[PDB]
Design an enzyme around this catalytic site. Structure first.
Site, PDB file in Angstrom:
ATOM      1  N   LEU A   1      11.794 -20.247  -4.839  1.00 56.42           N
ATOM      2  CA  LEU A   1      10.794 -19.420  -4.199  1.00 56.42           C
ATOM      3  C   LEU A   1       9.406 -19.602  -4.799  1.00 56.42           C
ATOM      4  CD1 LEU A   1      10.160 -16.791  -2.422  1.00 56.42           C
ATOM      5  CD2 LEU A   1      10.544 -15.521  -4.518  1.00 56.42           C
TER       6      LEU A   1
ATOM      7  N   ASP B   1       0.780  -1.188   0.000  1.00 55.94           N
ATOM      8  CA  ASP B   1       0.000   0.000   0.000  1.00 55.94           C
ATOM      9  C   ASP B   1       0.839   1.279   0.000  1.00 55.94           C
ATOM     10  OD1 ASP B   1      -2.608   1.143   0.179  1.00 55.94           O
ATOM     11  OD2 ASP B   1      -2.286   1.519   2.341  1.00 55.94           O
TER      12      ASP B   1
ATOM     13  N   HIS C   1       1.431   3.192  -9.369  1.00 61.00           N
ATOM     14  CA  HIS C   1       1.261   1.734  -9.508  1.00 61.00           C
ATOM     15  C   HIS C   1       2.390   1.171 -10.395  1.00 61.00           C
ATOM     16  CE1 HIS C   1      -3.250   2.129  -8.423  1.00 61.00           C
ATOM     17  NE2 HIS C   1      -2.603   1.588  -7.404  1.00 61.00           N
TER      18      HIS C   1
END
Ligand SMILES: C=C(C)CCOP(=O)(O)OP(=O)(O)O
Ligand SMILES: C=C(C)CCOP(=O)(O)OP(=O)(O)O
Ligand SMILES: [Mg+2]
Ligand SMILES: [Mg+2]
Lengths: 231, 231
Positions: free
Chosen positions: A128, A17, A34
């Site tokens: 991962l 955020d 963004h």
């Protein structure tokens, strides 16, 4: 020798955020932040893979984010398409397994096709595991597992009094991965906003004022250290 | 005029941690701190009722706390019995509705009898609703609602594809009360430890190093102010 999870931390989830505020602080439109957020996603994925983290889960689009402006929603979808194309071959070269968690039915064909294909190319990777929470909600997540169990009961395959925590646990997102150890939320808000409710029952929670596009390796190491010192 | 929820905060949940450490800091046994914790519960209930808070939910015994020492568990149960007897008439005089959330079957008759009776005396009260989470777990809470819905499905009263968030929401603890606005966790740990997972989806989370037996009105006001300034 392998890098044993930086500080004993196997699975990190991050609420990314502050994109909007970061752009506005600079006189720029929300979508500019963004776009800057995606470089920040790249940076975090890199740090996790290089420090032995088994799984990294990123909150990219909440099931509540559809109420935002139609035009902001569209650019988000296109940016996700663009990140898939720009990053996938590198994720594969890096032995990263890509999983998207959330309701992907709501996505347009192009995006759905990119997801399915990106997951199938990396499905056998063993490094991962990168989980992108897109159109995801923690409540929604619990309910999908609850439906899988409801069905089973309508098929006389299960009795209502057989259902317990571990059974539902075997039906929520990421149950085959190590549990979530640490949730980091950038941007300064002190809430979890419907992220992994079930899964974060015993997870450490770390909050930073740093905005997502500015989150770097040093900030990630800081969270990791805070976790190692969770005495 | 009535005191409109101090700072717009209708429902506060508190993880009352740090009793053990508080006693040990003083060379005292763990149970000495739990006894001091009860005065702290008294103080918080008072502050909430006097500041227009609609509901106060307190984490008193987790479903994971049974693994503690048998003798520590016994004194906890007896202290809960003792708090019920010492406080109930005053809760009734103060128009507080008392509800215990959690699996009370695991409690001994005496305690179960005290709970049932204390809830029936105050069931019609209309001021503060005080929820004591005893033998409670957030996962356990979701599962009980899931069972109520499983049953309904085995009774052909419901179809698995009808189940959604709001329906399950109508089956988790405290759904008839205002949602949880603020979770305060004393003691310094930064985790929610299986407390109200479903219910805290959009709640503010506040962490203080202050230990539970030392938590006072000033600390409560501090949390409230932090919440009012949650911009
Ligand atoms: C993960 C998403 C969709 C957005 C993150 O940043 P924001 O766009 O919420 O911008 P802020 O207003 O919170 O600063
Ligand atoms: C709500 C319960 C059962 C206990 C709270 O304090 P603790 O007994 O956990 O003591 P600490 O070790 O955490 O300090
Ligand atoms: Mg935001
Ligand atoms: Mg404790």
């Amino acid at each position: 020798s392998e890098k044993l999870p930086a500080h004993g931390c196997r699975h990190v989830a991050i609420i990314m955020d502050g994109n909007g505020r970061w752009a506005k602080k600079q006189g720029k439109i929300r979508a500019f932040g963004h776009k800057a957020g995606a470089k920040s996603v790249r940076r975090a994925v890199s740090f996790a893979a290089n420090n032995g983290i088994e799984a990294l889960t990123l909150y990219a689009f909440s099931s509540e984010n559809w109420n935002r402006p139609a035009q902001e929603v569209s650019a988000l979808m296109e940016l996700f398409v663009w990140a898939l194309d720009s990053e996938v071959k590198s994720l594969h070269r890096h032995n990263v397994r890509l999983r998207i968690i959330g309701d992907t039915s709501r996505f347009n064909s192009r995006l759905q096709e990119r997801i399915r294909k990106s997951e199938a190319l990396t499905a056998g990777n063993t490094g991962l595991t990168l989980n992108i929470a897109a159109n995801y909600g923690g409540r929604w997540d619990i309910v999908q597992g609850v439906r899988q169990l409801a069905e089973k009961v309508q098929q006389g395959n299960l009795q209502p009094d057989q259902i317990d925590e571990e059974m539902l646990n075997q039906h929520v997102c990421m149950h085959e991965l190590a549990p979530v150890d640490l949730v980091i939320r950038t941007g300064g808000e002190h809430r979890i906003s419907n992220f992994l409710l079930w899964q974060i029952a015993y997870a450490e929670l770390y909050f930073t004022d740093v905005l997502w596009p500015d989150f770097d390796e040093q900030d990630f190491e800081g969270a990791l250290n805070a976790f190692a010192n969770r005495e």
